Short mmCIF file of C-alpha atoms in Angstrom, two decimals:
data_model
loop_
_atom_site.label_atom_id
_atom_site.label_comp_id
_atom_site.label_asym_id
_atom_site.label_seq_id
_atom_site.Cartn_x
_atom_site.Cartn_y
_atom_site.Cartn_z
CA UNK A 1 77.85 62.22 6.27
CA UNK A 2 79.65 59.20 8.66
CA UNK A 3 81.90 61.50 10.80
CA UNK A 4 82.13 58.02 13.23
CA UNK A 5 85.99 56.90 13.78
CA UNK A 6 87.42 54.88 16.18
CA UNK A 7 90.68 56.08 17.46
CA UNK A 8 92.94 54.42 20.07
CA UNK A 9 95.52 56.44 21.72
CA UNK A 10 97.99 54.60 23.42
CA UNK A 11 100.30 56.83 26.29
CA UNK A 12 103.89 55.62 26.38
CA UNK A 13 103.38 51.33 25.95
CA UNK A 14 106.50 50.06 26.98
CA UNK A 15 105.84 46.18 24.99
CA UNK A 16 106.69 45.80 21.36
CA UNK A 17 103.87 42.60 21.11
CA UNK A 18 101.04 44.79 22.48
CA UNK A 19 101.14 47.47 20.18
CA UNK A 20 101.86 44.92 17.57
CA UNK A 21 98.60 42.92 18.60
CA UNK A 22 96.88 46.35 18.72
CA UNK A 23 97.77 47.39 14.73
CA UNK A 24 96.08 44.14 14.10
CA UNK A 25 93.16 45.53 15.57
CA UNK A 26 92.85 48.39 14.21
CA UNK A 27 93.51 47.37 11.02
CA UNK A 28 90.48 45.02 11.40
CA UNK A 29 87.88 47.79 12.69
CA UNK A 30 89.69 50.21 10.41
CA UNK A 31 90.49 52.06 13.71
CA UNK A 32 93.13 55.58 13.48
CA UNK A 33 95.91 54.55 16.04
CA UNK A 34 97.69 57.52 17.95
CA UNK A 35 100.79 56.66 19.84
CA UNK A 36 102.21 58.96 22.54
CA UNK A 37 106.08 58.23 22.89
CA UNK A 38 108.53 57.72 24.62
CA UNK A 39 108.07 54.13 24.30
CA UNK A 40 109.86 51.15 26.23
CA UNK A 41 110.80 49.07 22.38
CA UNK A 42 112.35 49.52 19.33
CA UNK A 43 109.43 51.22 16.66
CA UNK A 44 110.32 49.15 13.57
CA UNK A 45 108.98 45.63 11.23
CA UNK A 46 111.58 43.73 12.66
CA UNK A 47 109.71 44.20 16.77
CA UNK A 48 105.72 44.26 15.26
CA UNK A 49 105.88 41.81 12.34
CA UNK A 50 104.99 38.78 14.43
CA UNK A 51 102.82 39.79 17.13
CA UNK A 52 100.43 42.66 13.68
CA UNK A 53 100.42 39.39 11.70
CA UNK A 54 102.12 41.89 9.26
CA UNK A 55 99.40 44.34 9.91
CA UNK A 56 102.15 46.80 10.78
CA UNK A 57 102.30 47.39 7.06
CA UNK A 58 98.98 48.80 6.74
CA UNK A 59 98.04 50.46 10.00
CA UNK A 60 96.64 53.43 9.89
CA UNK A 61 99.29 54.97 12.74
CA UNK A 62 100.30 59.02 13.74
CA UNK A 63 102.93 59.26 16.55
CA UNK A 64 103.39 62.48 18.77
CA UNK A 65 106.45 63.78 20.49
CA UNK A 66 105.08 63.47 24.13
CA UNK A 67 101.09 64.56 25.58
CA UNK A 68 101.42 68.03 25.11
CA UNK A 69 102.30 67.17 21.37
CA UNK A 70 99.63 65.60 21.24
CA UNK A 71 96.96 67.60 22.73
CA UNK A 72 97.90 70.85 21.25
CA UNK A 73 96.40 68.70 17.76
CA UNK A 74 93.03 67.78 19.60
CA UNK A 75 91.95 70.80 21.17
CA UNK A 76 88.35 70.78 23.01
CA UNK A 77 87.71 66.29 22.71
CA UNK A 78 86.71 64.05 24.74
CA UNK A 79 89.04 61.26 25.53
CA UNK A 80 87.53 58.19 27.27
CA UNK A 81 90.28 56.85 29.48
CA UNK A 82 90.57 53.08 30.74
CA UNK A 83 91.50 53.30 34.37
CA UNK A 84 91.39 50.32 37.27
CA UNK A 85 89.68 53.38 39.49
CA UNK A 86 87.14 54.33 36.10
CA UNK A 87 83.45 54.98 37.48
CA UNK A 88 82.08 52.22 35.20
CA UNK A 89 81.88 50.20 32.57
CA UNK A 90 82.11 51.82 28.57
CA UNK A 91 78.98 50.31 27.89
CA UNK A 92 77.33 52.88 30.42
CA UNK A 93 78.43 55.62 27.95
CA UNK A 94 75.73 56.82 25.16
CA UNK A 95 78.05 56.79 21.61
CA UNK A 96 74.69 56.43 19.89
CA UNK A 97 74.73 60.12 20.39
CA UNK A 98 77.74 60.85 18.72
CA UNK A 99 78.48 61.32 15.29
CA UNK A 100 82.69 62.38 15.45
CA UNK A 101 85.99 60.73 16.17
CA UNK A 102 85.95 58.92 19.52
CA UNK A 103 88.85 58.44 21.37
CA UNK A 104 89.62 55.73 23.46
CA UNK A 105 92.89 56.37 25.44
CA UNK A 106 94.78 53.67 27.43
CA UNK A 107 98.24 53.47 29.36
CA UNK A 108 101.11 51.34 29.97
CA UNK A 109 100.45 47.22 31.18
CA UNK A 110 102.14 48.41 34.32
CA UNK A 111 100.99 51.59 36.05
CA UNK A 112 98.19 53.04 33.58
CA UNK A 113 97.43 56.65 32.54
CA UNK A 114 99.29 59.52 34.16
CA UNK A 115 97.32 60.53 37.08
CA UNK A 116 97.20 64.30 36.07
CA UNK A 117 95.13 62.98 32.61
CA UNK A 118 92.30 60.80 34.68
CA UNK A 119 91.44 63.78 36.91
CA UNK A 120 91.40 65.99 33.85
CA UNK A 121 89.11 63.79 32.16
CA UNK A 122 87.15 61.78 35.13
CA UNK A 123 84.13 62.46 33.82
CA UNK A 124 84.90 59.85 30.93
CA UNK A 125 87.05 57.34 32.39
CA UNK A 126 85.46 53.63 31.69
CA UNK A 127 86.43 50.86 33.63
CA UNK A 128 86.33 46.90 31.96
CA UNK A 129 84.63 45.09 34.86
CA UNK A 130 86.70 41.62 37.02
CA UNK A 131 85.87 39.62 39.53
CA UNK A 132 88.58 41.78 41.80
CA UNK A 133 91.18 44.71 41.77
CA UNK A 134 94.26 41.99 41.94
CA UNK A 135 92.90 40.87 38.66
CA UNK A 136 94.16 41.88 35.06
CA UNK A 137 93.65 42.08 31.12
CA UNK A 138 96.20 41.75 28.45
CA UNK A 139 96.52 45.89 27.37
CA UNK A 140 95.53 44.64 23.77
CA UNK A 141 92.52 42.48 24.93
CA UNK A 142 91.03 45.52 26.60
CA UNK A 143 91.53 47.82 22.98
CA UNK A 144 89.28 44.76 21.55
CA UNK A 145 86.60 44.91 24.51
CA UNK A 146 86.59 49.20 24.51
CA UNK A 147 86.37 49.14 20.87
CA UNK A 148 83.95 46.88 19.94
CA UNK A 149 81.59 48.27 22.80
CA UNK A 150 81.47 51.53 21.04
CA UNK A 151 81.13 49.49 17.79
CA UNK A 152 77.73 47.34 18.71
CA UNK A 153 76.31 51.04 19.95
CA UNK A 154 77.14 52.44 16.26
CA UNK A 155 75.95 49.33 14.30
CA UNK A 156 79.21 48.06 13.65
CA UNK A 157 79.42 50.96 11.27
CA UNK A 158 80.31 49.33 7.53
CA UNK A 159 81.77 46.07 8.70
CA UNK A 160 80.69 42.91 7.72
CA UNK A 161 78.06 41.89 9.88
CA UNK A 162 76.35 39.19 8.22
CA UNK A 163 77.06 35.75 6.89
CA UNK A 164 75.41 35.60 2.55
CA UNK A 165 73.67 32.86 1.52
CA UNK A 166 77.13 31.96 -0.89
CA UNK A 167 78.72 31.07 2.95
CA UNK A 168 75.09 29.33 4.78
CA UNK A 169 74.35 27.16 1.82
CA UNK A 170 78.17 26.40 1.52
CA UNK A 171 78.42 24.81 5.08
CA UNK A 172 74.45 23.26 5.37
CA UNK A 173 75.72 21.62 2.22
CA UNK A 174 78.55 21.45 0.30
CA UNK B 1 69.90 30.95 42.56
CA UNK B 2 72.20 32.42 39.88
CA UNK B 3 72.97 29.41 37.10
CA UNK B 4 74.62 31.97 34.66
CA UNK B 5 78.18 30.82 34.36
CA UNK B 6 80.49 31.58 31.17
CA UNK B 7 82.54 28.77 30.04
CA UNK B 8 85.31 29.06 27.11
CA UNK B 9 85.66 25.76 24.62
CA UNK B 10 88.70 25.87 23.06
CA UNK B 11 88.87 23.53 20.16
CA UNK B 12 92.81 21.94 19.63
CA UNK B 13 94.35 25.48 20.07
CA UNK B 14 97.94 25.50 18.24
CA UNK B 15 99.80 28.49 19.75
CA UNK B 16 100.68 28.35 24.21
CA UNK B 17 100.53 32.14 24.30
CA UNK B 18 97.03 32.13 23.15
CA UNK B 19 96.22 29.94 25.74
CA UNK B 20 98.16 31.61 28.65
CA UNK B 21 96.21 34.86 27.48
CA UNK B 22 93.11 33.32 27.43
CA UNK B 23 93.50 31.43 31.03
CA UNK B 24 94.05 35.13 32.12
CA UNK B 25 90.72 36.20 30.79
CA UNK B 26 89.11 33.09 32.44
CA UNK B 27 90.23 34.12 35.75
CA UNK B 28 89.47 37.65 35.58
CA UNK B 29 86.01 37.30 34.82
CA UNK B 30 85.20 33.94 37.10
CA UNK B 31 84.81 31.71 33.46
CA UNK B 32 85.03 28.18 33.25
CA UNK B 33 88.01 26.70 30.47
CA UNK B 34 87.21 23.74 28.73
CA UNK B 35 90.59 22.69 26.33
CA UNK B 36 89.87 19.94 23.77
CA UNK B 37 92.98 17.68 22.60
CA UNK B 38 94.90 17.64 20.96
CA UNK B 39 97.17 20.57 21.23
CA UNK B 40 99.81 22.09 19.05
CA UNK B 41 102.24 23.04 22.01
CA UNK B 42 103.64 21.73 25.63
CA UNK B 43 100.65 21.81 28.17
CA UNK B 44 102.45 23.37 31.72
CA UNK B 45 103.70 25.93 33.71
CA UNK B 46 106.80 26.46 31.52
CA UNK B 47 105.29 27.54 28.60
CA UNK B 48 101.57 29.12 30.03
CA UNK B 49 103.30 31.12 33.00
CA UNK B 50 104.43 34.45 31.10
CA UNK B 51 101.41 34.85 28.74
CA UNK B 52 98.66 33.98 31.81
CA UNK B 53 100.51 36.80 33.62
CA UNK B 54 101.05 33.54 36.18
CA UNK B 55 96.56 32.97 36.21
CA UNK B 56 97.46 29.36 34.80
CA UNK B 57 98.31 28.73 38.44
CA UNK B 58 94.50 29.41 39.48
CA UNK B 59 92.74 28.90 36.46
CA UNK B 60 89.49 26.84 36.31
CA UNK B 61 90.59 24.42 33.42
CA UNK B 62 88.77 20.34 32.43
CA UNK B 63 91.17 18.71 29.60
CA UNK B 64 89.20 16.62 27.02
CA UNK B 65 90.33 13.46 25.09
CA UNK B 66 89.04 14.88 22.06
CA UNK B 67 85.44 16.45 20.65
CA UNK B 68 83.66 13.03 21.50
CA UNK B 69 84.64 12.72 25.26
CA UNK B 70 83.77 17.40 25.15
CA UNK B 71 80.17 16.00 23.84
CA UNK B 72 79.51 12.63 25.83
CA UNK B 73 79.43 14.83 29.08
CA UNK B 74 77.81 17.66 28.03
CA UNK B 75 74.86 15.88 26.35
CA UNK B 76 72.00 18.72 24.44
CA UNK B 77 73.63 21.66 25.44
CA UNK B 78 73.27 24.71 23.17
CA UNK B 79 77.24 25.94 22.10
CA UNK B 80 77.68 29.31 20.47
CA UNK B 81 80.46 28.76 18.23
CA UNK B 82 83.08 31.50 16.50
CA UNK B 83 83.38 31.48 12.73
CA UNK B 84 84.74 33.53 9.84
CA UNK B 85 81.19 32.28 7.57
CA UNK B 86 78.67 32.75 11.18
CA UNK B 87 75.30 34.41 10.57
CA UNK B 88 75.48 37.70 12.38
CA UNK B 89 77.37 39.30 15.87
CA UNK B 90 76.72 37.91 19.26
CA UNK B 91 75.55 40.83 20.40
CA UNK B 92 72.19 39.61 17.86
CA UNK B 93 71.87 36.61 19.85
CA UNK B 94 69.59 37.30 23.61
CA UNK B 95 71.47 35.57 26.52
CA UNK B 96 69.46 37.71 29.06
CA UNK B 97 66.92 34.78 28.05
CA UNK B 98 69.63 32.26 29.70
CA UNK B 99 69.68 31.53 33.21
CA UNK B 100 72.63 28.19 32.84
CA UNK B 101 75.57 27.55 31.28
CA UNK B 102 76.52 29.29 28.25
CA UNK B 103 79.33 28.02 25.88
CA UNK B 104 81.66 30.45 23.53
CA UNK B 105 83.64 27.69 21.27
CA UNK B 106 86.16 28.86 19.39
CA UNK B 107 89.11 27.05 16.96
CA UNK B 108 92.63 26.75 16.02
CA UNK B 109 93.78 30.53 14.84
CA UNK B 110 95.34 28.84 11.46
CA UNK B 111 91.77 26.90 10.26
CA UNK B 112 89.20 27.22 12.68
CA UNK B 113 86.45 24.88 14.10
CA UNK B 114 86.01 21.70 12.37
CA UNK B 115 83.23 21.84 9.30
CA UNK B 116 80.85 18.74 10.83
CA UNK B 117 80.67 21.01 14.48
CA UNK B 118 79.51 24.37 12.52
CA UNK B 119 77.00 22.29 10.42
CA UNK B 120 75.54 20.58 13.40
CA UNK B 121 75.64 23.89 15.22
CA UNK B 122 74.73 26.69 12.39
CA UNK B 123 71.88 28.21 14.03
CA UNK B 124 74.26 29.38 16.78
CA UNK B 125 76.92 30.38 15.17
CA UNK B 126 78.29 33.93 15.30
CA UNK B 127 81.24 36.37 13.75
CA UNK B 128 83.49 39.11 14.75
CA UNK B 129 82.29 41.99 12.24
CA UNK B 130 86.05 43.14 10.56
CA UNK B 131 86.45 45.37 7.84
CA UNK B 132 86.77 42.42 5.20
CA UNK B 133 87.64 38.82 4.97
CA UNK B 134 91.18 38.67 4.29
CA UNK B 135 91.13 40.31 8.23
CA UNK B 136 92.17 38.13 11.30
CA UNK B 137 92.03 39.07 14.89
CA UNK B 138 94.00 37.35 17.61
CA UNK B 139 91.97 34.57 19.04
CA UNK B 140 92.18 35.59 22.54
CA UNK B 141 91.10 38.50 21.78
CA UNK B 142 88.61 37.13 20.17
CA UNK B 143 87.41 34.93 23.84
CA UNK B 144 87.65 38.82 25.27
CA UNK B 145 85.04 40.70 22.75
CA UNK B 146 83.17 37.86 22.85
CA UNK B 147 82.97 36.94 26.79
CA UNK B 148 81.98 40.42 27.63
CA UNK B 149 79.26 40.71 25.35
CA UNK B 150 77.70 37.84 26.78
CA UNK B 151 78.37 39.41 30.41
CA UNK B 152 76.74 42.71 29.30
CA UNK B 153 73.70 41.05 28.68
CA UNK B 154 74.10 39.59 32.06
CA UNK B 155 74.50 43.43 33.55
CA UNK B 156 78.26 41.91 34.65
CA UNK B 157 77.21 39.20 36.93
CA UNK B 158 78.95 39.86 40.64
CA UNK B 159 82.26 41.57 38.53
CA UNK B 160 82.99 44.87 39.98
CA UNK B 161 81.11 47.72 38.00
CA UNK B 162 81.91 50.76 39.75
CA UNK B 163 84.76 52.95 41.42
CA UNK B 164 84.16 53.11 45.44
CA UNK B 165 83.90 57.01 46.90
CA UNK B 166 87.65 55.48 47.95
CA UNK B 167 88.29 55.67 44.16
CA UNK B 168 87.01 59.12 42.94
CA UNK B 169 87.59 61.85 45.70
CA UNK B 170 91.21 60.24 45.68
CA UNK B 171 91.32 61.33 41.85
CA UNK B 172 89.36 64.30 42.04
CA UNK B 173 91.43 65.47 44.63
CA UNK B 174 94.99 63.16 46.55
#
């Protein structure tokens, strides 16, 4: 059987339109999101409406009291962490090789993952490569560029890859 | 020498804080931003500053009259152009092939890229692979997923790949 899931795990975000942007995501991969609270918004449709494109309604979405919470659930994984000091890029992983949930962990736009989680798990911390260490990514953006990584290694799994004739004929004609 | 270069086409983008996220891509991975008239929204500091995380300020950005002036100076190039009906991923197409100029276009998040472009340009074409077709991502995200595929290819130009010895035995032990 397909045991291959994408999960995201987001540690304490602290902006309603990143998470929001991120639901949209998911819901587009059909990605399991796991959010780690406290968070720095208001949880509800009236904050992630806009920013989902009403995705929020559809998300596939568990939340957990604090880390601990969530760890005691997912004993003995690996979590691939996005960290500015992360020994290289995701596509330097092998996913090919796996055939489970993968989780792809990342922290708060301002200051990251707690530091006590990287050295726990800096073995599989990934880095997203920029033309300097002054230089950022939009928190969502990076979700897109992790996920889709792991996606292109697994043959985009059972998304729509490919453009039928009913579209190619449509456009080189009609 | 090195002629590899990524430049970004945006064609008549609606929404400024798709733009502002998208200049902060640009800038973080060294890409060239090429904005094609007209636009649904105020074009300056006021209204790019917050979703650029302040990049518009150093952004490498050419304004265009409109698709005809885009073309007239860039005369038989090759563009690789985003669409919900394109024939497979980008990660199909083989830019390791490319030593120039490559360009990503991509439309208006409501409709698109006009019909006449993707006809003229179907053989270059490419999608985002999503679950189904009533799915949407963000299009900046979109620029991301799409900019780094290329610059995989491209083993990440001069970006920065990997943590520094500074880096790691600061994790693994400070």
């Amino acid at each position: 059987m397909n045991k291959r899931k994408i999960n995201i795990v987001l540690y304490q975000p602290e902006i309603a339109q990143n998470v929001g942007a991120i639901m949209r995501t998911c819901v587009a991969i059909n990605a399991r999101l796991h959010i780690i609270e406290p968070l720095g918004f208001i949880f509800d449709d009236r904050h992630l409406s806009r920013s989902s494109a009403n995705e929020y309604k559809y998300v596939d979405c568990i939340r957990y009291d604090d880390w601990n919470d969530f760890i005691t659930k997912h004993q003995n994984i690996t979590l691939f962490c996005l960290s500015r000091y992360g020994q290289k890029p995701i596509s330097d992983f092998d996913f090919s090789k796996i055939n489970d949930n993968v989780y792809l962990v990342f922290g708060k736009e301002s200051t990251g993952i707690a530091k006590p989680i990287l050295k726990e798990h800096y073995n599989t911390t990934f880095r997203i490569p920029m033309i300097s260490e002054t230089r950022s990514l939009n928190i969502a953006n990076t979700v897109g560029i992790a996920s889709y990584e792991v996606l292109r290694q697994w043959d985009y799994l059972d998304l729509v890859k490919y453009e039928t004739q009913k579209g190619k004929d449509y456009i080189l004609s009609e």
